[PDB]
Structure formats: C-alpha cells, structure tokens
Design a protein around this ligand. Structure first.
Ligand SMILES: C=CCc1ccc(O)c(-c2ccc(O)c(CC=C)c2)c1
Ligand SMILES: C=CCc1ccc(O)c(-c2ccc(O)c(CC=C)c2)c1
Ligand SMILES: [Ca+2]
Ligand SMILES: [Ca+2]
Ligand SMILES: [Cl-]
Lengths: 178, 178
C-alpha cells in the first residue's frame, strides 16, 4: 500500500548493483596489486554502501566526515576509493558509495504534492534497507561482494569514519578466520 | 672489419626498442595517475637503459646497488619500476633496464674459440653505445622516450643509484625549463 521503497530497492539492485558488482572484485584485485606495492596496504574487496536514514547524500564524502578523504578512482559508471583517517593516520581503505535512491526519498519529502512527510521518509528509508538486504541475501555473487551500512546520525557527535572502520575491521576478521 | 657491436645495436633497436618504446609513455602516463595519487610522486617518462662498460648484467638491480630497490611492474615483454634511495629516502622513480646485448659481449669473451678478449669486449661495448646513440638520434619517437646511461665502474666506490639520479634530475630540469 504505497511503499515506494519496494520499487526503489528492486530498481537499485536490478539496474545498478547486479550490473557493476560481478567484476568489482576483479577491478579491486587488479588495483590491489599496486596499493600493496605502493603503500603497503590493501583495498577492501567489498563495495560499501552508505545508507544514512536521514536520506542526506552530500556531494563529497569529506563534507559528511573530514576523516574520509578521497584517495583514488578505481581504474576499472564511476567508483571511488576512500581512505579513512584516525588521528591523521590512514586506518582503512575502501570503495565507498551512498545509495542513490535515498536522494529520491529526500526529494519526495521536499515535494509538496507527494504528501510525503519526514516521518514517511524515515519509514521508507528503513524499508529500503530491509528490502535491499533481503534481495542481496537471495543473490549469489552480489551479497558476497558488497555490504550495507545503515545508521541514523543522532540529534550530536557522530563519526561516519568510525562506523565504516568497525565494518572494515569486521570484514577482515572474517577473511582470516573463515 | 669484425665489429659485432654494429649488428647488436641495430638488432637491439629494430627488434626491441622500436617495438616497445612507442607506447611506453602511455603505459607510464596511465600508471602515473596512481603514483601521484598514492605516493605523491611521478615515475619518469623515459626508459632508462643501463650500459655498463664491463658488460656486467646482474639478475637483480639491487645486487649491483642496494639503493636501487624494485618498486613495481609497469602494468602495460616485461618492464620494471625501481625506486632510487638516498639515506633511506626515496629520491627518484624510474623504469630501468640493462641493455641485454652486453651479456652477449660478456659471453663471447668467456668463449674460447671466439678469440675475443676483455680488451675486445670493452671496445665493442663502447662502439655499441656509440652506435645505439646514433640510431636513436635519427629516430623520432624513440630518442625522445628513452635515455642511455653508460659508465665504467672503476677499479672502488661507485654509486649506480647516484648516476641514475643525476640523470633523472637532469630530465626533470629539461621538462620544466623547455
Ligand atoms: C531508480 C533508480 C535506481 C538506479 C538505477 C540505475 C542506476 O544506474 C542507478 C545509479 C546508482 C548510482 C550511481 O552512481 C549512478 C550513476 C551516478 C554517478 C546510477 C540507480
Ligand atoms: C640480438 C638480440 C637483441 C634483442 C632482440 C630482440 C629482443 O626482444 C631483445 C630483448 C631485449 C631485452 C629483453 O628484456 C628481452 C626479453 C627478456 C626479458 C628481449 C634483444
Ligand atoms: Ca547526515
Ligand atoms: Ca659491474
Ligand atoms: Cl595502478
């Protein structure tokens, strides 16, 4: 009954994730030869998808957290590698991306004829997370190479960099134990 | 009258330099995007060809000078990027290569039926330098993208790294002034 998130999630997977994920690991593997050689680091293998529940998608990641600095472009329509800073030290490296459909939810909430409120936007943002999560679960070489980071920035200290970092560190713990 | 260097130089240019040089700059340009991004450095654009007059070609560059450390493989039969060290600091970066025909001159000097002495080898090594130099001079997109480094290690402190470094620094002086 009027749930826009359902089609937004399906569309985001069918029209985008399913197309770009399969080779993303190859792309990152090809790249990681040089990062290991050049900077004695490795870029995580998964695509990290930022799902802020305020549907707030900035144009630069650095505007949302200065500890997230653009690093490089995955050479491989366009994917970017970011470094995560702690105390000015590089703590992690990451192909990182806002889920675009959340801008549609924000735009709908500023569009008066939709009758879509801020409370409606937040419920749709959660449902979009739940739905995309279910879709990836039933997908074979999609769930394995990307992970979803959903968070409400609070009402107000919040480190998006630390929230990505606990995930990056978790992913690595899984690679080496299992 | 029995000058082997003449054919060795022609063959080294016709069969190898002429084939791999034309794109080498593209290869290095493509690569230099990431070195600038990753390590705030740039890999010199020319191919540097080591021409030791003792025809002594080691299997590792580092065995000939520990201040020349392998860095990376030009991604692009096989070309390698080296870093040059000064006091443990990276001072330069460089696609660096021994001229292979000099191994033939060395092997000939250890082959008894050739009647080729160490004095013969050194004259042929010099003539090979002179001849390759003349060939590159009359070649358009060959001379511009490689440079020849000829040297006699003395009889005995000698820094091959410093000898490459003065050249790298000279090449850069030319890029920015002219
Ligand atoms: C209904 C919209 C979902 C949808 C469908 C197809 C797409 O390519 C993208 C998309 C997602 C992220 C992107 O970054 C881009 C390209 C922008 C630079 C497109 C979304
Ligand atoms: C007569 C010999 C000159 C000559 C002719 C064709 C070649 O490909 C090479 C050559 C030079 C440097 C190289 O590194 C290699 C491949 C070895 C890894 C071949 C020399
Ligand atoms: Ca926000
Ligand atoms: Ca030597
Ligand atoms: Cl690279």
């Amino acid at each position: 009954n009027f749930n826009v998130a359902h089609g937004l999630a399906w569309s985001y997977y069918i029209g985008y994730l399913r197309l770009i994920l399969p080779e993303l690991q190859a792309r990152i593997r090809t790249y990681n030869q040089h990062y290991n050689n050049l900077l004695r680091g490795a870029v995580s293998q998964r695509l990290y998808i930022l799902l802020p529940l305020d549907c707030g998608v900035p144009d630069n990641l650095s505007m949302a957290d200065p500890n997230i600095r653009f690093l490089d472009k995955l050479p491989q329509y366009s994917n970017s590698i970011y470094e995560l800073l702690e105390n000015g030290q590089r703590a992690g490296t990451c192909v990182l991306e806002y889920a675009t459909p959340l801008q549609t939810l924000f735009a709908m909430s500023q569009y008066s004829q939709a009758g879509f409120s801020r409370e409606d936007r937040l419920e749709q943002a959660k449902l979009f997370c739940r739905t995309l999560e279910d879709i990836l679960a039933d997908a074979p070489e999609s769930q394995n190479n990307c992970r979803l980071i959903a968070y409400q920035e609070p009402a107000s200290s919040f480190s998006l960099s630390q929230e990505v970092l606990r995930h990056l560190r978790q992913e690595e713990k899984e690679e080496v134990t299992v």
